Design a protein around this ligand. Structure first.
Ligand SMILES: *[C@@H]1O[C@H](CO)[C@@H](O[C@@H]2O[C@H](CO)[C@@H](O[C@@H]3O[C@H](CO)[C@@H](O)[C@H](O[C@H]4O[C@H](CO)[C@@H](O)[C@H](O)[C@@H]4O)[C@@H]3O)[C@H](O)[C@H]2NC(C)=O)[C@H](O)[C@H]1NC(C)=O
Ligand SMILES: *[C@@H]1O[C@H](CO)[C@@H](O[C@@H]2O[C@H](CO)[C@@H](O)[C@H](O)[C@H]2NC(C)=O)[C@H](O)[C@H]1NC(C)=O
Ligand SMILES: [Cu+2]
Ligand SMILES: [Cu+2]
Ligand SMILES: [Cu+2]
Ligand SMILES: [Cu+2]
Length: 534
């Protein structure tokens, strides 16, 4: 249907690459003698001229940019990130794809008010994967993500580096953060505030830029796709501009949780909110061509309900040179890794229905605001469970996400007989798309940390109103590991703390080297991640 946002100069601005975030300090962990990387991120308002010939857009971002800066962290290095709110609304940071302790996971009520900060302690022990960090503040997650609070966090492993996949952040390893927004006639953002169904957006962005282009060489590139949109799901394909309907083959190498067992030969990639898929595209057969990255219409080929607009079939263009300046020394091995699947279980799947209760998006008829009723599952730590995720609706779709865990997709049924499990769903994931009338069974090891964790739809409008609940990964009282201080996301020890802006700007007082060092060493003594050792 007709674009609402102003006409945009399509494919004229280069694809921006978010800069890599550098830690301020390293602190010796007195428990293990290892260095903890300490980072400071300032959440603040800024403006950005998205439309060349109109006014600016008002944004609020990590370090006053959108997307947020990219973290690049090796497995085995613990990090602490001081997320400092210097904005106008509260925040809660979640590292999506990290088995963080409950009080470092971005529990929706575990907020930082403007003029406060929270220290988040991350383990960085899981399989190499594309994580992302984004806002999770109760009721305002959609608008906080939409106005710019999302960034990438790449967990690296030299074992993955030895596969010789296309490499170098911003060279042949390219972040592809997809959003879908709407703009006013003067080039400001249309707010998601007041939307209670879905905010589709009519302007497609990659790394914060509407409809960009990139100059590429005729060789293989790693693309790290993330759907960071509020409500738009995508069916991605690549096409020569000389045959814009003919899909070109590519390989999917990784899902949310890390590498597939084998690359999946693909010409169409379904990706819904919060899904990461890493793709290798080989431009070598397309020297001197223009390859358009496009998006399936028809509400993602009858799987979704998303509105299509005039230009939401277009994502970006790749202008391919006639030859490479350096040899392509990259490869996509037929065997990528042994995926660490959980044990199969014979236990009766739990059932969760994602539907509506009057006007509210609910799980089993419950809204996250309803403290009394929102704790829908108690699961002993170390248990494997199958969850049957049911979308009985034909007029909504729900990408479902479970915190803490990686899961295997066991089965999909479609009441429209549309599809089953996709080949790129063969590995481990943490989001799965319930298309129209879809039921998906996932199987997950509820390990290794006890605590209260969220699961929800990652359509942020649904999530905000109010399609989110909690599970408690439980332990017996003789279980050690300081569990009494790490099970409760609201534990006073880990709460946000007020700061003076001068202190921050001068790196004095509680931002002195002494104060940060004492704080992180005290945190480290509690040994939050010890139960994941080996
Ligand atoms: C999510 O799961 C966690 C467990 O993984 C759970 O935390 C547990 O809460 C229980 C119950 O509150 C705690 O056990 C209590 O400990 C205190 C202090 O030592 C005791 O006073 C309590 O004794 C009561 O129960 C006794 C019966 O055995 C009675 O004799 C007595 O009258 C008391 O009423 C009780 O044992 C336990 O320490 C925690 N466990 C951990 C590891 O923190 C948490 O509550 C769950 N979250 C939610 C929201 O459900
Ligand atoms: C649980 O957390 C406590 C508190 O940080 C840890 O105890 C500290 O350990 C070091 C080394 O023995 C001492 O120097 C500190 O004084 C301790 N503080 C207190 C008051 O005990 C404890 O080691 C942690 N336990 C586990 C199992 O991780
Ligand atoms: Cu998320
Ligand atoms: Cu998450
Ligand atoms: Cu939903
Ligand atoms: Cu979440």
């Amino acid at each position: 249907v007709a674009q609402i946002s102003p006409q945009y100069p399509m494919f004229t601005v280069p694809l921006p690459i978010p800069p890599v975030k550098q830690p301020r300090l390293t602190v010796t962990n007195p428990v293990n003698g290892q260095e903890i990387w300490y980072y400071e991120v300032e959440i603040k308002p800024f403006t950005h001229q998205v439309y060349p010939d109109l006014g600016s857009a008002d944004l609020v971002g990590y370090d006053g940019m959108s997307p947020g800066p990219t973290f690049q962290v090796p497995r085995g290095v613990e990090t602490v990130v001081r997320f400092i709110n210097n904005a106008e609304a509260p925040n809660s940071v979640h590292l999506h794809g990290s088995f963080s302790r409950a009080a470092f996971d971005g529990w929706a009520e575990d907020i930082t008010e403007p003029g406060s900060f929270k220290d988040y302690y991350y383990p960085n022990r899981q399989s190499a994967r594309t994580l992302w960090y984004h806002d999770h503040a109760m009721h305002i997650t959609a608008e906080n993500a939409y106005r710019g609070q999302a960034g990438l966090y790449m967990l690296t492993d030299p074992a993955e580096d030895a596969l010789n996949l296309p490499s170098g952040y911003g060279e042949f390893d390219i972040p592809m953060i997809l959003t879908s927004k709407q703009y006013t006639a003067n080039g400001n953002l249309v707010t998601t505030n007041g939307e209670l169904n879905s905010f589709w957006g009519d302007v497609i962005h990659v790394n914060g830029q509407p409809w960009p282009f990139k100059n590429v060489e005729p060789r293989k590139y790693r693309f790290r796709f993330l759907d960071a949109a509020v409500s738009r799901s995508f069916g991605l394909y690549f096409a020569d501009t000389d045959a814009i309907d003919t899909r070109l083959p590519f390989k999917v190498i990784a899902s949310d949780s890390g590498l597939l067992e084998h690359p999946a030969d693909t010409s169409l990639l379904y990706i819904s909110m919060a899904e990461r898929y890493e793709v290798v595209f080989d431009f070598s057969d397309y020297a001197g061509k223009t390859i358009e990255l496009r998006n399936l219409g028809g509400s993602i080929g009858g799987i979704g309900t998303d509105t299509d607009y005039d230009n939401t079939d277009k994502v970006m263009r790749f202008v391919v040179a006639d030859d490479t300046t350096q040899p392509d020394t990259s490869v996509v091995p037929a065997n990528l890794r042994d995926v660490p699947f959980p044990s199969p279980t014979t236990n009766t799947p739990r059932q969760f229905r994602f539907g509506r209760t009057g006007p509210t998006w609910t799980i089993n008829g419950v809204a996250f605001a309803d403290v009394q009723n929102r704790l829908l599952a108690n699961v002993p730590v170390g248990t494997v469970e199958r969850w049957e995720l049911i979308n009985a609706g034909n007029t909504w779709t729900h990408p479902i996400h479970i915190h803490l865990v990686d899961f295997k997709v066991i089965s999909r049924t479609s009441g429209n007989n549309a599809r089953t499990v996709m080949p790129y769903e063969s590995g481990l994931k943490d989001v799965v798309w319930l298309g129209r009338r879809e039921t998906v069974v996932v199987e997950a090891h509820y390990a290794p940390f006890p605590g209260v964790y969220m699961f929800h739809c990652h359509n942020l409008i649904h999530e905000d109103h109010d399609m989110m609940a909690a599970f408690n990964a439980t332990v017996l009282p003789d279980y050690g590991y300081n569990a009494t201080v790490f099970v409760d996301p609201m534990e006073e020890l880990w709460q946000a703390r007020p700061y003076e802006l001068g202190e921050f700007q001068a790196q004095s007082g509680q931002f002195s080297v002494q104060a940060v060092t004492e704080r992180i060493q005290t945190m480290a003594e509690y040994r939050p991640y010890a139960a994941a050792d080996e």
